[PDB]
Amino acid sequence: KDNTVPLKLIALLANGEFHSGEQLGETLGMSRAAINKHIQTLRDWGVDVFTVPGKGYSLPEPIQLLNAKQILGQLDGGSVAVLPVIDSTNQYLLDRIGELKSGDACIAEYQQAGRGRSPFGANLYLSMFWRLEQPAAAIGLSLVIGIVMAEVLRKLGADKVRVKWPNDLYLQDRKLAGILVELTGAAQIVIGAGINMAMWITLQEAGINLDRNTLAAMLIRELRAALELFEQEGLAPYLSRWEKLDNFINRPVKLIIGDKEIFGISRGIDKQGALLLEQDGIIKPWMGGEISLR
Ligand SMILES: O=C(O)CCCC[C@@H]1SC[C@@H]2NC(=O)N[C@@H]21
């Protein structure tokens, strides 16, 4: 589907100023009526577009937009698809499985059909593909994903970001991002993450205003590095990193595996990513479940 116009559209409105269809139509080369039409779409996307008869149209606040140019600008190789508007980042790659290479990617700020459980540009969506030579992963994998993501965020300045075994990023004990892995029966995986940029906790909301093009870029970079590191040394190289980032480490949690709630103190992960729950002076690992403050 061709979504160009509204994007071009959104692009003008970007500068959080006022814009009249007359104004607009000029530049776009179309009926104000045409414009009204597209304006509606942005609206459909959850875009915030105000309309003052006398005034014209505008956005409540300037916004930043993905820009492949910028993104690919700071990137050395690998295919990367920038689709501000899309069904789902994961699906997109899932769909192209035979045409990819580990590292190929896809970036969006709007998902019209996200997999795994949100207004345009309020979030950042990233998905990557990787072919693991040897399920020499899974749980390892998700771990590495949150490490890095949390690392990068930090570099750009969000220092209190933390990881939550085994797949979310946390900020002030709130969820900020979410990883999603998908295997395909050499393993073929599709990694996908969503971050809360703006508006249960958002970068904005926490005074952090990162340049999305940058973030986008860093992650891709950093990710491919991480993944190749992992591909040949597994978890080991990250053990210490996990620990420093662990949000719950040493805190009292409540683990929910299927139908049972289990309480205990978190003591991080083992060399395999299993969480280590200490109950009644005993420490044992857990390979699954859902962690939670308590
Ligand atoms: O939704 C989340 O919070 C956690 C799961 C993350 C889902 C990611 S968002 C990018 C990728 N594309 C999808 O369709 N889902 C995943």
CA-to-CA distance for 82 and 179, rounded, in angstroms?
19
Contact call for residues 108 and 86 (beta carbons, < 8 A): yes
- Protein residue with least CA distance to atom 15, ligand 1: 115
Angle at 228 between CA 227 and CA 230, to 5 degrees: 65
- Judged by DSSP in three states, 198 sits in coil
Q: Does 178 contact ligand 1 (Cβ within 6 A)? A: yes
Contact call for residues 60 and 48 (beta carbons, < 8 A): yes
- Only one residue has tokens 């994998």, namely 141
Exp. method:
X-ray
DSSP string across 154-176: HHTT-TT-EEETTTEEEETTEEE
β 110-111/123-132 pair status: unpaired
Contact call for residues 144 and 230 (beta carbons, < 8 A): yes
Contact call for residues 111 and 166 (beta carbons, < 8 A): no
Q: Does 196 contact ligand 1 (Cβ within 6 A)? A: no
Report the candidate in 121, 109, 132, 113 with the shortest Cα–Cα distance to residue 191.
Answer: 132
CA-to-CA distance for 142 and 165, rounded, in angstroms?
9
What proportions of the chain, in percent to the nearest 5, are helix, strand and coil? 35, 30, 40
Report the candidate in 40, 5, 70 with the shortest Cα–Cα distance to residue 220.
Answer: 70
User: What resolution in angstroms does the PDB record give?
Assistant: 2.8
- Protein residue with least CA distance to atom 4, ligand 1: 178
Report the candidate in 163, 73, 86 with the shortest Cα–Cα distance to residue 124.
Answer: 86
- Judged by DSSP in three states, 15 sits in coil
Report the half-sphere exposure of 136 (CA within 13 A, side-chain side).
15
Does 111 carry a binding-site annotation?
Answer: yes
Which domains does the chain possess? 1-63 (1.10.10.10), 64-247 (3.30.930.10), 248-290 (2.30.30.100)
Q: Does 116 contact ligand 1 (Cβ within 6 A)? A: yes
Report the candidate in 115, 57, 54 with the shortest Cα–Cα distance to residue 88.
Answer: 115
Please give the torsion angle defined by the CA atoms of residues 234, 240, 244 and 247, in that order, rounded to the nearest 10 degrees.
Answer: 40
Contact call for residues 90 and 108 (beta carbons, < 8 A): no
Catalytic residues: 117, 175, 294
Report the candidate in 249, 242, 231 with the shortest Cα–Cα distance to residue 271.
Answer: 242
Segments in the chain forming alpha helices (H): 4-13, 21-28, 32-44, 68-73, 89-96, 139-155, 212-231, 239-245
